Design a protein around this ligand. Structure first.
Ligand SMILES: CCCCCCCCCCCCCCCCCC(=O)OC[C@H](COP(=O)([O-])OCC(O)COP(=O)([O-])OC[C@@H](COC(=O)CCCCCCCCCCCCCCCCC)OC(=O)CCCCCCCCCCCCCCCCC)OC(=O)CCCCCCCCCCCCCCCCC
Ligand SMILES: CCCCCCCCCCCCCCCCCC(=O)OC[C@H](COP(=O)([O-])OCC(O)COP(=O)([O-])OC[C@@H](COC(=O)CCCCCCCCCCCCCCCCC)OC(=O)CCCCCCCCCCCCCCCCC)OC(=O)CCCCCCCCCCCCCCCCC
Ligand SMILES: CCCCCCCCCCCCCCCCCC(=O)OC[C@H](COP(=O)([O-])OCC[N+](C)(C)C)OC(=O)CCCCCCCCCCCCCCCCC
Ligand SMILES: CCCCCCCCCCCCCCCCCC(=O)OC[C@H](COP(=O)([O-])OCC[N+](C)(C)C)OC(=O)CCCCCCCCCCCCCCCCC
Ligand SMILES: CCCCCCCCCCCCCCCCCC(=O)OC[C@H](COP(=O)(O)OCCN)OC(=O)CCCCCCCCCCCCCCCCC
Ligand SMILES: CCCCCCCCCCCCCCCCCC(=O)OC[C@H](COP(=O)(O)OCCN)OC(=O)CCCCCCCCCCCCCCCCC
Ligand SMILES: CCCCCCCCCCCCCCCCCC(=O)OC[C@H](COP(=O)(O)OCCN)OC(=O)CCCCCCCCCCCCCCCCC
Ligand SMILES: CCCCCCCCCCCCCCCCCC(=O)OC[C@H](COP(=O)(O)OCCN)OC(=O)CCCCCCCCCCCCCCCCC
Ligand SMILES: CCCCCCCCCCCCCCCCCC(=O)OC[C@H](COP(=O)(O)OCCN)OC(=O)CCCCCCCCCCCCCCCCC
Ligand SMILES: CCCCCCCCCCCC(=O)OC[C@H](COP(=O)(O)OCC[N+](C)(C)C)OC(=O)CCCCCCCCCCC
Lengths: 96, 83, 168, 316, 101, 98, 70, 98, 347
């Protein structure tokens, strides 16, 4: 009985995963837009805060390479609300 | 032929716990090699898609990679449903 | 004040080490290590390691440290230095804490920044598994060599401690 | 609502523990041809309230203890942990839905040993200290087989989540495929909680650690001890007697699940009334020479059995 | 945040019962009342510790069964348990698990 | 690096000094030695977890298993000293001065 | 008689019924009359956070169906 | 290694965990996989004396992805400026940043 | 101790040492050290007396502290490089910790106070493993990280090792202590040339092991541990005294014996790098080692110290000790100078 039930649970997991796979292309597309938008929001406000600084460049990469580098938490949510910062940092770790 | 029987029946009357322990452990090490279903265990694990199946750029000479998920090419899990 | 939970825990973590590094009676020394071990798990948990965090509780706190308390109660026969060391330790912690929360940069051997631990976390995470879980599972699929050497050391450990304690 | 939710889980435990004392005295009474508490209130239903009040307004001795800090620390640690082991239990919905809930109840369980150890130190008596050490050796010994037996079961479940043991037994109880493990799990839970025939701490004519305690502090060590008896049997029912879960009628699960826990708990009282008491060495040699060899043998059988039958449970 | 509250409430409550337990009976102003090493126990603690460590390596077995190297994973799972049995057989034969002096 | 390292790393330094300054008891030194391995565990896991070094995730477990095995060895020797003198004072381990 | 033991069992039975029944009903009170979402793996959490933003009101249990599509 | 036995016998004992761009279970990439790959391929087969001077660029980026010191310095600068403009009535945060 | 257990315990010490040598991962390098210390303490306790207990307790407290420092260095290196390969360390602070951690393992000064005492509390056979085999594993690691080692840290430890080794041995009368301090002295030569040509560290390691193994072997043959008890050898086994004399001159670096080969080649390599002051100081201070080696020869082979009446009884029994490889070791300890160019096999 355990062998049969465990084998159905493996078929029901594959079906559960294929629903995710069919959805990843849409979720990945949305995240790309969201992350780029959040970066530009910081970029626009980087100019505001530092438009009168002695010798500062706006949007200067700290990498000699020109390759795209995935932003870390500090760069995206740097100047957002604490509730939203807390949600994106420890929200999943703290979810019950 | 007699010594084995004369020894198996001696421990069975004195160490039933150990006789069951070594017997049970002995099956754990032997059966997996004799089982005909051990190969299915591997096939099912390889069939679980933890990762996205990144598509392959089409160059023209690939009559083994389906163009659409429902095309007849590629691996088929018809063995897993019947199992 | 909750977004700085990990840093707050680490300050309690250091204060525990001063607790038993000052070497009070072993009974109180073991207690400080227990409080430090428990808080140490809290730090690891908040970085995403749930198996490793609970491993400390099961193996280190509930395991090893029980034997330390077990041996202390059986081989210990139940000062100015203890207070002076403990007082000295906290003051060093206090200044280090004070100077990292003031200018958010402290340079002792290394260059430590004080913006906040969350600033380095990884934004993207959308997998259907725990990366820590898959790494630990790979002990049997990848770490065949580690298993053999580790197993032979624990097996030898049993033999070795039976010789040491026999006394004849 | 979460804070309301916690209190809806703590107070019932304290009341449930209080009336397990009545049920134990009555059930033991009728197996002994007597009645037990029936005078204080209808059918003794007020007997726990008299005992609770009586203990808490009795002078505590609190003798010249060596530390007097571990004396206060031991009862807090014991009762704090006992209550903490209920937050992940699905009934059918956990208060906290831990992904490694089974691993959390093992971690907390191993910490209960300190409550024993610190009470022995605080007592300031050499005799008490030997009493604690004997109870520590028994507790850690029989918690080795719990870890392995629990691990063997999970090889049929596929994960450490407790709510996934409900899915595993959706067709049949795990008591059937793993009755050998169930036999050794149930006896292990007796030895962990110092229940007869493994009660050597309360084994008068031979020894306990909680002897110097009286009045209120004593009642704390008693509540913690009985709060784990219920919890272990709730754990056993979820592990070997899985109740079917219907999401539209979540109360149906609770009624069936509650019965299976009550019956398992009343089996602790049934066993205590039947058998004599093991000797200390005799219950050590029951673990290191009988349970451990079989637990190891069955753990090998359970790692390989799913592979050789092609019945590996899903990871998620 | 929920688990932290659950721990706080559990241990916070346990402390309130303790203080009132030590102080409520003090409402009654009662008259002032006036006035070794055994080796075999140490080996149990150490023997548990070593086995406990050997268990630590067995805990991730439920996840290891999901790999595509069942031949290698299975071989090591039995290797550890078998050695965990050899540690037991060694102490057993050398009179490790005995309580007679 | 990050604020957490300053405190985790300073914890190792504190315990190390405690290991190198014995007071009276040999036991109190073992705790400091076992304090050092606790800090190394935490620091190891933080580095491994943060950088998503997937296969390294088993490394902290090995550090704990071996470090724990060493402790058992250290406690076994501490017992064999109390057997000889009745106490675990370090000043009794002075026979090999000459 | 043996059935005089039941009243103590029922009260003990009831006290063990409240913790389970309370959690089930309280969860449905906060989650719009549904089960509380279970998020054991990051993908599940990602969708739940997506629901929070998509739902309008900052509530993850408020589902938007086809009616919310143009 | 001192005795390069593994290369002689063609067996992989502990080279699978040496780096973080090596094959991982379920193809889980490390956070700094792209940088580590670039550094390793730059400094391959030219010894460490040349790699110290010829692949410096590829390695500084790698160490930037590991500890993020340059990034945290840059964010500290922006915060100090913004904080200064906050207590001067000269800064108004945007709507979505509140 | 059951004989079978002894072999498996010995075989574990080799496995620990070998794991450090063949491994390419800092984790296994640490496991190799941990496995080695675990399986070596039992042999140090075999006689089960208070001195043996104290020696192991002093030994455990030292190798454990070194292991924690070595693991700490392995982790700092991980933070700054994100890899475990056994090669040049990538953080200078990690390099200092690894260097000192390995120094505590080799007994190099000033982390030396345990070597005279540990070697003096354990039997002669246990000292042999402690002073010959136990140095291969730490030396393997140094041979792989020397490009990143700090020049002044390593040379300073070498300089202090020679001085304290020579000065410590002048005051000694116990053979186990003399070999302990002699060991500290030769360690300076092994590490002094390490920055310049590591191959000469293997030459000095191999020759040191052969000579030390010979000495401990001949002390075990007569069960002699003190200077006086060794002075009776002329009256029991006169041949043994001549063999001792030859080796002590070899250990002292006197031409034309094999023990001159390492010192000779180290001086050559340090000078090519224009290091003239350091080799000259090292060679002069080596005369301190040659002093108490000579003092042994005066009481052992070059004079006939008073005997005892009971010695006449010992003449009626032979040496029933195994003395494995003694004939080969003594010949390679004194008659290898013409073969010096053979050192290229170590490259
Ligand atoms: C090139 C350079 C070449 C130089 C090589 C130097 C070799 C010199 C050996 C010393 C002389 C041996 C001796 O006289 O006995 C002393 C001593 C026994 O004297 P004892 O104290 O009276 O008896 C102790 C017990 O009571 C024993 O009592 P028991 O009744 O319980 O008996 C137990 C059983 C035990 O029998 C054994 O001892 C066998 C042990 C297995 C050795 C491993 C096999 C290696 C091959 C497979 C790989 O029998 C014995 O004890 C035999 C007596 C010892 C003779 C055998 C010595 C073999 C050494 C040659 C192999 C060297 C490999 C390294 C050794 C391991 C590292 C610690 O034996 C030793 O333990 C010697 C330890 C040697 C450590 C130094 C090894 C040299 C390091 C350099 C390695 C090469 C790098 C290049
Ligand atoms: C590579 C090929 C090298 C040739 C290896 C063959 C020699 C080793 C086997 C001889 C042996 O049984 O004892 C070795 C070995 C050492 O014992 P030993 O006390 O040094 O042997 C001398 C006694 O007089 C032994 O006296 P015994 O009468 O009691 O033993 C009689 C033994 C007599 O066999 C002998 O001739 C012993 C002397 C053989 C030479 C020993 C050194 C091994 C060769 C090393 C060469 C190093 C070259 C360095 C060159 C550097 C410059 C380029 O005859 C045999 O049993 C031969 C067995 C054939 C296998 O015994 C063992 O414990 C292992 C078994
Ligand atoms: C406080 C008073 C003393 C508490 C002692 C009891 C400790 C409880 C166990 C520790 C928490 C835990 O293990 O979480 C596992 C569980 C395991 O959960 P999980 O593995 O299922 O993951 C949860 C999130 N998902 C499932 C989505 C991945 O952790 C959590 O659920 C939440 C983690 C919150 C992290 C915050 C921890 C703060 C508390 C740690 C410090 C405790 C100090 C102890 C003082 C010394 C005493 C030992
Ligand atoms: C030998 C001495 C020790 C014995 C211990 C005896 C007590 C342990 C409990 C064993 C008896 C099983 C519990 C019977 C009472 C349960 C009542 C109940 O939940 O409804 C009937 C339950 C209802 O079913 P269920 O939902 O609880 O479990 C069935 C699970 N599936 C559907 C997957 C098979 O069924 C029975 O118990 C029939 C008997
Ligand atoms: C290939 C991969 C697998 C590799 C496995 C290899 C490792 C196995 C590890 C085994 C675990 C350690 C136990 C081994 C020691 C056995 C116990 C022992 O040490 O000997 C005790 C016994 C002493 O005898 P005594 O008590 O004095 O007098 C009565 C004897 N009748 O001495 C005796 O004479 C007892 C007899 C010896 C014990 C034999 C045990 C055999 C176990 C294998 C049986 C397999 C059967 C499986 C078949 C199942 C089919 C139903
Ligand atoms: C001294 C004697 C010692 C004992 C000797 C062995 C006794 C017999 C084996 C008992 C132990 C194994 C337990 C296996 C339980 C599996 C459950 C079961 O028996 O049901 C059979 C099951 C049904 O197949 P199913 O696919 O569900 O059919 C419908 C599909 N449309 O189909 C399956 O379960 C899959 C088949 C699994 C086969 C596992 C056994 C492999 C070994 C081949 C048989 C040889 C037995 C070994 C004998 C030598 C012993 C050393
Ligand atoms: C970095 C900063 C390092 C300096 C921290 C100084 C901390 C010392 C505080 C004073 C102290 O610890 O007590 C004095 C010390 C030991 O205490 P003591 O009073 O001597 O106890 C026996 C007296 N009969 O007495 C001493 O022997 C002084 C020890 C050196 C300091
Ligand atoms: C079908 C046929 C099935 C196979 C046959 C069964 C296996 C044969 C071996 C069974 C007999 C075991 C040996 C034995 O007789 O043990 C007796 C002895 C008891 O001694 P004791 O009770 O302490 O005496 C005190 C007196 N006052 O105790 C001993 O001698 C010590 C025994 C040690 C046992 C080690 C326990 C660990 C191993 C548990 C099993 C795990 C699997 C082992 C690996 C299996 C590999 C296949
Ligand atoms: C008397 C002899 C036996 C002795 C005692 C036996 C042991 C005690 C019995 C086991 C413990 C059970 C105690 C609880 C039983 C009483 C509660 C009950 O029967 O269920 C009531 C339940 C409440 O309704 P509710 O959940 O709020 O539905 C809302 C839908 N919108 O209504 C439902 O909907 C349930 C479906
Ligand atoms: C002798 C003292 C030894 C060291 C412990 C200090 C205790 C007293 C507080 C002084 C230091 C300080 O500034 O306290 C404050 C810090 C809080 O840090 P935070 O929340 O990250 O602040 C930054 C976040 N804000 C801006 C919202 C405040 O407290 C701790 O981290 C807690 C230490 C354990 C108690």
């Amino acid at each position: 009985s355990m062998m049969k039930w465990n084998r159905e649970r493996r078929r029901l997991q594959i079906e559960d995963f294929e629903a995710r796979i069919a959805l990843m292309p849409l979720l990945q597309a949305e995240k790309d837009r969201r992350v780029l938008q959040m970066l530009r929001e910081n970029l626009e406000e980087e100019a505001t805060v530092m438009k009168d600084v002695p010798g500062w460049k706006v949007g200067e990469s700290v990498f000699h390479t020109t390759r795209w580098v995935t932003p870390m938490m500090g760069e995206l949510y740097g100047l957002r609300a604490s509730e939203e910062v807390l949600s994106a940092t420890y929200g999943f770790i703290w979810y019950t | 032929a007699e010594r084995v029987a004369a020894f198996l029946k001696n421990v069975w009357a004195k160490e039933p716990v150990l006789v069951a322990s070594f017997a049970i452990a002995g099956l754990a090490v032997i059966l997996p090699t004799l089982s005909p279903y051990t190969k299915y265990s591997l096939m099912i694990n390889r069939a679980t898609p933890y990762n996205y199946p990144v598509p392959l750029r089409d160059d023209g000479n690939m009559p083994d990679v389906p163009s659409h998920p429902q095309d007849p090419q590629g691996p088929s899990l018809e063995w897993l449903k019947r199992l | 004040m909750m977004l700085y939970i990990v840093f707050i825990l680490s300050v309690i973590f250091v204060m525990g080490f001063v607790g038993f590094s000052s070497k009070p009676s072993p009974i109180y020394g073991g207690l400080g290590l227990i409080v430090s071990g428990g808080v140490g798990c809290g730090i690891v948990l908040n970085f995403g390691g749930s198996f490793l965090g609970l491993m400390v509780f099961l193996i280190y706190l509930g395991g090893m440290m029980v034997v330390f308390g077990y041996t202390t109660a059986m081989a210990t026969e139940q000062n100015k230095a203890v207070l002076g060391a403990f007082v000295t330790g906290l003051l060093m912690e206090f200044f280090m804490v004070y100077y990292v929360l003031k200018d958010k940069e402290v340079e002792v051997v290394f260059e430590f920044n004080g913006l906040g631990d969350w600033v380095i976390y990884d934004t993207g995470d959308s997998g259907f598994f725990s990366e820590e879980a898959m790494g630990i599972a790979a002990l049997y699929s990848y770490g065949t060599w580690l298993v053999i050497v580790t197993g032979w050391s624990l097996l030898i450990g049993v033999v070795v401690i039976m010789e040491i304690t026999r006394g004849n | 609502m979460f804070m309301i939710n916690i209190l809806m889980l703590i107070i019932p435990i304290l009341l449930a523990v209080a009336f397990l004392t009545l049920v134990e005295r009555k059930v033991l009474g009728y197996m002994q041809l007597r009645k037990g508490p029936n005078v204080v209130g209808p059918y003794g239903l007020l007997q726990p309230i008299a005992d609770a009040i009586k203990l808490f307004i009795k002078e505590p001795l609190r003798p010249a203890t060596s530390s007097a800090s571990m004396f206060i620390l031991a009862p807090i640690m014991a009762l704090g942990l006992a209550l903490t082991m209920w937050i992940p239990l699905p009934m059918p919905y956990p208060l906290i839905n831990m992904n490694l809930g089974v691993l959390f109840m093992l971690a907390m369980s191993s910490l209960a040993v300190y409550s024993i150890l610190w009470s022995g130190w605080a007592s300031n008596s050499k005799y008490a200290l030997i009493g604690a050490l004997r109870a520590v050796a028994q507790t850690i010994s029989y918690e080795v087989t719990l870890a392995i037996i629990l691990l063997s079961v999970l090889l049929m479940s596929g994960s450490f989540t407790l709510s996934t043991l409900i899915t595993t037994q959706e067709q049949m109880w795990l008591i059937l495929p793993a009755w050998p493990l169930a036999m050794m799990w149930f006896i292990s839970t007796l030895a962990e909680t110092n229940r007869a025939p493994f009660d050597l701490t309360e084994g008068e004519s031979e020894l306990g650690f909680n002897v110097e305690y009286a009045a209120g502090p004593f009642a704390l060590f008693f509540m913690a001890e009985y709060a784990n008896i219920i919890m272990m049997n709730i754990f056993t029912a979820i592990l070997f007697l899985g109740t079917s879960h219907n999401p539209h009628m979540p109360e149906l699960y609770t009624i069936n699940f509650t019965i299976k826990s009550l019956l398992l708990t009343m089996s602790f009282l049934w066993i205590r009334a039947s058998y004599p008491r093991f000797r200390y060495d005799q219950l050590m040699h029951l673990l290191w020479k009988n349970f451990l060899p079989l637990t190891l043998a069955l753990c090998m059988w359970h790692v390989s059995l799913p592979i050789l039958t092609s019945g590996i449970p899903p990871q998620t | 945040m929920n688990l932290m509250l659950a721990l706080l409430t559990n241990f916070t409550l346990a402390t309130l019962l303790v203080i009132i337990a030590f102080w409520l009976p003090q409402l009654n102003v009662y008259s002032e009342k006036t006035s070794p090493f055994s080796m075999k126990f140490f080996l149990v603690a150490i023997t548990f510790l070593l086995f406990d460590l050997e268990i630590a390596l067995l805990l991730p077995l439920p996840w290891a069964s999901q790999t595509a190297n069942l031949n290698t994973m299975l071989t090591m799972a039995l290797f550890l348990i078998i050695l965990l049995a050899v540690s037991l057989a060694y102490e057993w034969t050398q009179k490790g698990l005995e309580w007679t002096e | 690096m990050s604020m957490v390292y300053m405190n985790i790393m300073m914890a190792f330094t504190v315990s190390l000094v405690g290991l190198l300054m014995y007071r009276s008891h040999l036991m109190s030194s073992l705790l400091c030695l076992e304090g050092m391995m606790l800090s190394l565990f935490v620091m190891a896991a933080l580095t491994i977890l943060n950088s998503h070094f997937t296969l390294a995730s088993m490394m902290p477990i090995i550090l704990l298993v071996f470090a724990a095995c060493e402790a058992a060895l250290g406690l076994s020797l501490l017992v064999m000293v109390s057997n000889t003198y009745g106490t675990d004072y370090v000043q009794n381990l002075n026979l090999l001065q000459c | 008689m043996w059935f005089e033991v039941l009243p103590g069992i029922a009260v003990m039975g009831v006290c063990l019924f409240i913790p389970g029944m309370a959690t089930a009903r309280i969860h449905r009170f906060s989650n719009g009359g549904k089960e509380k979402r279970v998020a054991h793996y990051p993908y599940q959490w990602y969708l739940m956070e997506r629901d929070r933003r998509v739902s309008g009101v900052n509530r993850s249990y408020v589902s938007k169906g086809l009616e919310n599509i143009d | 290694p001192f005795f390069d036995v593994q290369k002689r016998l063609g067996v992989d004992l502990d080279r699978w965990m040496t780096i973080q761009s090596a094959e991982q279970p379920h193809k889980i990439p490390s956070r700094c996989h792209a940088f580590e790959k670039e550094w390793i391929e730059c400094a391959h087969g030219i010894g460490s004396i040349r790699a110290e001077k010829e692949c410096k660029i590829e390695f500084e980026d790698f160490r930037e992805c590991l500890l993020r010191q340059k990034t945290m310095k840059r964010l500290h600068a922006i915060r100090r400026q913004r904080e200064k403009l906050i207590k001067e009535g000269k800064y108004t945060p945007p709507p979505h940043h509140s | 101790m059951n004989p079978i257990i002894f072999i498996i315990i010995l075989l574990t010490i080799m496995l620990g040492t070998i794991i450090v040598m063949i491994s390419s991962h800092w984790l296994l390098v640490w496991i190799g050290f941990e496995m080695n210390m675990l399986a070596i303490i039992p042999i140090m306790m075999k006689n089960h007396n208070p001195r043996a207990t104290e020696a192991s307790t002093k030994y455990f407290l030292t190798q454990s502290t070194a292991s924690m420092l070595l693991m700490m260095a392995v982790i700092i290196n991980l933070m700054f490089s994100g890899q475990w390969t056994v090669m040049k360390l990538f953080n200078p602070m990690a390099s200092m910790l690894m260097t000192m951690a390995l120094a505590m393992k080799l007994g190099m000064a000033p982390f030396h106070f345990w070597v005279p005492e540990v070697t003096q509390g354990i039997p002669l056979s246990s000292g042999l493993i402690l002073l010959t085999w136990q140095k291969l594993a730490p030396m393997s690691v140094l041979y792989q990280i020397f490009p990143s080692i700090n020049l002044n840290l390593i040379l300073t430890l070498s300089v202090l090792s020679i001085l304290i080794g020579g000065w410590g041995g002048l005051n000694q009368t116990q053979l186990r202590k003399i070999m302990a301090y002699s060991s500290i002295a030769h360690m300076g030569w092994m590490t002094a040339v390490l920055p310049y040509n590591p191959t000469m560290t293997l030459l000095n390691l191999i020759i040191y092991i052969i000579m030390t193994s010979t000495m401990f072997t001949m002390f075990m043959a007569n069960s002699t541990t003190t200077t006086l008890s060794l002075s009776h050898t002329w009256n029991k086994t006169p041949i043994m005294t001549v063999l001792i004399l030859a080796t002590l001159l070899s250990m002292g670096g006197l031409p034309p014996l094999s023990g001159f080969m390492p010192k000779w080649m180290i001086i050559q390599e340090m000078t090519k790098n224009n290091s003239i002051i350091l080799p000259t100081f090292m060679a002069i201070t080596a005369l301190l080692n040659l002093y108490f080696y000579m003092r042994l020869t005066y009481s052992t082979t070059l004079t006939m110290f008073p005997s005892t009446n009971n010695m006449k009884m010992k003449w009626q029994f032979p040496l029933m000790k195994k003395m494995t490889f003694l004939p080969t070791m003594v010949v390679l300890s004194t008659m290898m100078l013409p073969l010096t160019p053979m050192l290229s096999v170590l490259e």
